[PDB]
Amino acid sequence: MELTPDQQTLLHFIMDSYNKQRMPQEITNKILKEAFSAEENFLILTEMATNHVQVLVEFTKKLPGFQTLDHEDQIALLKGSAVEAMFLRSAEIFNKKLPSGHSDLLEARIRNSGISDEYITPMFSFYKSIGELKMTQEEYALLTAIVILSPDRQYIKDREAVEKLQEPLLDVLQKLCKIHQPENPQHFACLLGRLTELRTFNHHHAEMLMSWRVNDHKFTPLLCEIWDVQ
């Protein structure tokens, strides 16, 4: 019932590629340092989000078997998951342990960053729900890989090929949820639960950026391609 040699291998490979990530401290210090204007925060968001896409493409190309997929499906999988992965990474960083009152300050600073009021509540409740699961670094890494490798995505021609790649990650995640958290047998199901709720941020992702309380909404060409902006 414990991780097979192949599953230990899959895991370590996923964890190393996921570790190529931007340092979470960098992000949270900057936000906690001073209270920036909605305009400075929009710019920080656009730069953080463009770099995120760049890092996501690299992590994705390294996902076992991703390179073997149809080129157009490769684009639809990345385009279909990029926003979700950014929200999942934002969720992770939100629940990263900080000194007393810092998490409350980080929350208040994000709350007054320039994002429209209509997006605030669903965004923070997802961040808190991820937190209530006290997810490990290997869970965030596997969940990101599972999110990218989702076959039930609009425009995927060969879903079965995507199913073949998502299944070993689902199996590894399940085993980790049973070996490392036997007190909560529902843990794997609850992680799969968060994934369905991650999909709710895609409906109005472009509007999240367009309603930012700034006079001008400038984006990078890469962001324009991933977000449905400009």
Binding site: Q54, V57, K61, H71, Q74, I75, L78, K79, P221, L222, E225, I226
Partner: peptide, 12 residues
């Protein structure tokens, strides 16, 4: 047409 994304995937 996702030209940038296609480039980032097809490079190396």
């Amino acid at each position: 047409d996702h030209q940038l994304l296609r480039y980032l995937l097809d490079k190396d």
